[PDB]
Amino acid sequence: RRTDEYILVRQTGQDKFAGTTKCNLDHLPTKAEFNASCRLYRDGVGNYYPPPLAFERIDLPEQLAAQLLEPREQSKQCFQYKLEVWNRAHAEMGITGTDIFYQTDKNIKLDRNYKLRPEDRYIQTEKYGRREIQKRYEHQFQAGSLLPDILIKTPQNDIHFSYRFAGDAYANKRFEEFERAIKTKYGSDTEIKLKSKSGIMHDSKYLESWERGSADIRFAEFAG
């Protein structure tokens, strides 16, 4: 097992957050602490998934989805299939607060493509502009739908968090420059994650292996 297979994130302010990596925890968190945090799970390339996405990243069989029409019993049969995969993973990681945080915000109605209306798909920060999201959750912090743009994880597994804004210290500067100043400050083994609209924090090198310059595209976009 990896020492950084999860990170526990907490809110400490208006648009302010702190994280601790599994191996840096000074105590064994209770189920309450586990359930109040945003829990980030490391996948096979060092992307980090918050709970409702780590859970839905499990997948269902073709012949099982066609045969299923109903509606609300539709939510209960999908859940029991993934719950056994999920439970078996939490047990191995030692996590006792295993809430998923899938519950949707029920004041919000979808358009015919089963997606958010444009007026419902933004979070407002106090100082940093708006950010687009994929889904409206009843528990927005725990679901991962409230994190900053940038997660830095140093060689000691310490977490630093950052927001871009229009005209900040890196305005019209390239991701690779930010990257070089990060590894100068922290060590060249430092990891940088860049947040997806879903809440996923994709590792910067994973993004570049997918398409050269993707890390930079995502970095620029946070600042408009």
Helix/strand/coil percentages in the chain, nearest 5: 30, 20, 45
Among residues 123, 90, 97, the alpha carbon closest in space to that of 195 is found at: 123
Instruction: Give the span between the Cα atoms of 156 and 16, in whole angstroms.
Output: 22
CA dihedral (158, 163, 164, 165) in degrees, to 10, reads -150
DSSP assignment string, 35-68: HHSEEEEE-TTS-EE-HHHHHHTS---HHHHH--
Number of alpha helices (DSSP H) and beta strands (DSSP E) in the chain? 7, 10
List of E strands, the chain: 6-13, 16-21, 38-42, 48-49, 122-124, 130-132, 150-153, 159-162, 191-195, 201-203
Q: Which residues of 88-111 are buried (b: 16+ CB within 10 A; e: fewer)?
A: ebeeeeebebbbbbbeeeeeeeee
Q: Which residues contact 96 (CB under 8 A, 6 or more apart)?
A: 29, 30, 31, 34, 90
Q: Which residues of 8-29 are buried (b: 16+ CB within 10 A; e: fewer)?
A: bbeeeeeeebebbbbeeeeeeb
CA dihedral (203, 206, 207, 209) in degrees, to 10, reads 160
Instruction: Give the span between the Cα atoms of 23 and 35, in whole angstroms.
Output: 18
Label residue 30 exposed, middle or buried (CB < 10 Å: 0-12, 13-18, 19+).
Answer: exposed
What would the two tokens of residue 159 be?
A: 């977490």
SS3 105: coil
What would the two tokens of residue 222 be?
A: 């946070």
Label residue 210 exposed, middle or buried (CB < 10 Å: 0-12, 13-18, 19+).
Answer: exposed
